[model samples]
Target: PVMVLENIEPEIVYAGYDSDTAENLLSTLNRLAGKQMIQVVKWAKVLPGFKNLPLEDQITLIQYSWMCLLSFALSWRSYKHTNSQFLYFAPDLVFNEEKMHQSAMYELCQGMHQISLQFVRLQLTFEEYTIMKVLLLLSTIPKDGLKSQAAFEEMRTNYIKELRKMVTWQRFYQLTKLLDSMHDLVSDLLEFCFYTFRESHALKVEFPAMLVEIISDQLPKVESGNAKPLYFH
Candidate 1:
């Protein structure tokens, strides 16, 4: 069962962008993000230590970390598919410099591109990437804490220890550094997301229903700096 499980892959999601307009680019990205949001929740349910958390904690964790998780996955995909040269958002929706410039998300994509470059530079293994995604899922919380703080800490520590087993201290430092950098980029990403979401009607950008719920719930906390993201550095 374990060996056979590795053979199954998720279906490829298409962004469904048909036009060349900037709105289409933003809409397509948002559309793609919405599709990925569902997958992140599905993937998390099966992650080790995830199901053990209180149901509310599980919900809150996914709410807080979905953007980070998506961005991390985007970096990995871009690394493998584009050699860190383009944003490999989907099988059908790839973004080069022109698309990025046209979309007015140049700075954000640049930061994301830099992360993919680090992946290429490090030659990141699948095991390490898997653990890091777990860490990112565990990396943020409410300013006060989770419902089961102890449980959350224990799970976070186990994953960190799992990472330690696979890497030397030097390698650990580099990976954690890369992880910390994500918060910086994602902070900006959430801001852009909020802006785009708020102005969607004016900008003609379409957000999926699922994404609207998640983003609306996340906005106030993030804007007030109440969503605290844990960092190694």
Candidate 2:
């Protein structure tokens, strides 16, 4: 496969911790999510046409779409690395069914597993995934509209054009549908994320300050149904 990524993908180091307690396990996952969020911003910055959007629009898109982007990448990695059998959060951290249950996020893990299974069924290529990631970054925006709405639309259309090169009508349908499905699972994941963040002190879990900031901004938007995610289906 050709290298479709504009820059080399970055690696995330897991901040390993002791104790299989639910709090610690969930904390570890949140920390990893935080690390990946940094990469998400980096990716978007280098992404074609993304920078053309206004500064506030750029921040808005990243904050709203980080969870979807993270979950999509996790599913793709899990599919490639483990045939969708485990949650491949990173090279240093993989979660099997037992860990998923012990972490008290078994249902969330199962939801993620289903997405990975779709990737398996499609035999998705990394080239296709790269374009899809771009589309995901552009997938969410303010319900009222972005500051650079026209720029956003043109950029998204270009990626849609890029995606068409690798897919047929049916293949495109499935891929776009798959992308939309990420939002469905993301809702639950964020609900869990917000709950965990709210009770972090009592749960004895820790989250990165960076994650705290983004999630803190995102929580109100989500709960009030102000955060709107774009979908194909």
Candidate 3:
């Protein structure tokens, strides 16, 4: 029941804005650029969580998620690169088609499918299998059409709801654990980006550090060992 994001609508937030009165628009732009770099680092760190699972299950989930991101990134980069007059907010860059094609999106999808079939052979939960399948299917949606902001929002909402329906509290706990691990990974990636990219040039430094700090701060409260009732089926 996972929802597919076939198209994402354009939003002004994504396009960034032009300020006429700002005395330091250049600095502001620099900060935003830094933020984007940090995001890539964060994303890379979030990529490996499934590997901590049973080996047989690792490839399917990771590959599926990776490919999905790749596809979306491709479309986004394309829009930004060409400065295409698409109604949505796009990055102010040129789409490097060669680079996009070189991305490992298709390869990751293929790997996920192969690994998933093995999960099927092992008789994992139907819900688990179905969730993986849904993730893979989502990776297939053409990113080129994702300019429809409404469609993307609907797809995201539906996907979240479907994920909620597919797992119980215990399963949700496991998923949260995975997310925590990803947060840590992203934090490390952010640190690396900060040092490698030079903080003064990049705005992304604060955001990832902020995310890491926030998530780390909240972890203890969530894991504080207070027993709670299970509300979801």
Candidate 4:
């Protein structure tokens, strides 16, 4: 492991209640989260040796990894060096105790807080970020529904080998904590973004077309015999 992040965390700039939330529904505002997801995917595609992947394998990684990628790069949005007792998504949209409860997302706040602190402590390099994005993409376990399961496994194996050469053994573990922290923040919210888009009409909102397409691809499947929905993870 290397040195911890050196910069001092700034004072908290807290936001008010849900009544203070702002939006510009006429254009690209609501798509902040959606636009961010697209950027992470684009960054992954441009990384060395990524495009050579099979088209089938590429699609598999994108769908499964976008959430992890979001939670990873989103440290830029969330990091505050523990100054505030909230997860900052943007200037006007911080998720603190009241917002967490109002959104019924209170449980996720602590995981979000833990990861924010970790990012503040361990400032990873640009190299770490790139390879880690690829690793996150490859981290999803294969399932029966994926016809390209074998291809994904092959690419994931190749990625691991490449990652081994880039960072030292200890450094890799440090970076992987970022990956694990991201998985925690994303697992609960990714599907929510999906269903939120689908049910936007009930919320009296309109979702961007691109947002709908990407989130739909990543939506979790439900089993036949379950008594309740399988989304609370």
Superposed model 1: Cα runs more than 4 Å off? 1-11
Could you give candidate 1's per-residue lDDT for residues 1-233 as a string of tens digits? 12222332234677877757778788888888888887777776766788899889999999999889889988988887888889999888888889889998998889898999999999887668878888999999988788999999999998898789868578899999999999999999998899988888799999989888888898965568678889899
Per-residue error for 93 in candidate 2, Å, reads 0.7
Error of 1 at 220 (Å): 2.3
Question: Local distance difference test, per candidate?
Answer: 0.85, 0.83, 0.33, 0.54
lDDT of 2 by residue, 1-233 (tens): 12636354556556464547887787788788778888777766766678677779999898888888888989888988998888888887898989889899898999999999999999998888888988888888777778878888898888888888768487899999999888889889988889888888698878988789888998966576677788788
- Residue 199 CA error for candidate 1 (Å)? 1.6
Residue runs of model 4 more than 4 Å from their true location after superposition: 1-19, 22-30, 80-110, 145-151, 220-233
Ranking of all predicted structures according to lDDT, beginning with the best and ending with the worst: 1, 2, 4, 3
**Per-residue accuracy of model 4 over 1-233 as CA lDDT, tens digit each:** 11111111122332322442212221223455556555555555555455566666676667666666556544545664334346666575666677666554466566667766766577655455555666676766435445565665566666566557766467566766566656656767665565556676665545666656655555535212111111211
Which candidate wins on lDDT? 1
Error of 3 at 58 (Å): 30
Q: Give the runs in model 2 whose Cα sits over 4 Å from its true position.
A: 1-6, 15-19
lDDT against true structure, model 2: 0.83
